[PDB]
């Protein structure tokens with residue numbers, strides 16, 4: 001079971017900064033920079049890591065929000081959830097150190113490779129994401145921000161859930177009255193499924209937010225990505241059931257994808273645009 005943080009040392013190892021080397025800047029965060037580097041483990045093994053720093057002159061609220069992410073992440077030890085190696089708090093800059101994911105955020109990765117992966121490769125990515133979400137939901141953690149931009153992908157194309165800190169990704173009931181449940185994460189997973197099969201196209205493109213909300217409420221849904229297998233478009237539609245009780249559970253999604261992996265011929269049945277489809 002996940003436990004809410006409103007203490008980081010309950011679920012995070014304090015790392016010795018002597019064991020951390022910084023290579024290069026790879027991103028910018030809400031709280032500071034993100035860089036790649038190396039961590040020397042107690043066993044002397046050296047691994048690649050990502051390193052997030054807390055900007056100099058941070059507020060106490062920024063420090064709490066920053067470390068709160070580590071307090072959450074550190075609760076989850078799963079191959080498809082980003083691994084917290086530890087934190088540095090006894091020296092400054094304060095740091096959160098995670099496993100390195102060479103191919104970065106999934107949405108930007110797929111946009112660089114439009115139509116270049118096999119369907120079975122894409123299904124492999126999606127099964128990873130579903131398996132990580134199955135574990136989070138098993139722990140009673142509702143992610144609320146599941147999106148392709150919040151999944152990281154490593155050198156072997158293994159995808160892992162990130163962003164333990166968005167109308168297009170949010171279920172109608174969560175939009176309507178903040179009803180967030182693992183079923184609203186399943187809705188979001190449906191959107192990620194579409195993002196993946198669309199090679200990182202933006203869900204609902206740049207439609208006015210009020211129109212995203214109204215259209216989905218009226219029963220309109222994102223259309224099948226080009227060359228999308230029928231099995232995968234149906235899974236999207238299933239994830240986007242209006243009635244949250246009718247959506248599949250993450251364990252069911254994992255099982256569906258495992259069958260598709262086992263019987264790749266299943267994927268050969270293909271469905272039938274920047275237009276929504278009624279239903």
Ligand SMILES: Nc1ncnc2c1ncn2[C@@H]1O[C@H](COP(=O)(O)OP(=O)(O)NP(=O)(O)O)[C@@H](O)[C@H]1O
Nearest residue numbers: 026027028029030034050098099100101102104105
């Ligand atoms: N574990 C990691 N391995 C490799 N690159 C990473 C890792 N974590 C983050 N990054 C890179 O740093 C970027 C920003 O990190 P992210 O975790 O998305 O923080 P953020 O505050 O959400 N910033 P942004 O998403 O750019 O608004 C990502 O797009 C990745 O390219």
Ligand SMILES: [Mg+2]
Nearest residue numbers: 105149150163
């Ligand atoms: Mg991000």
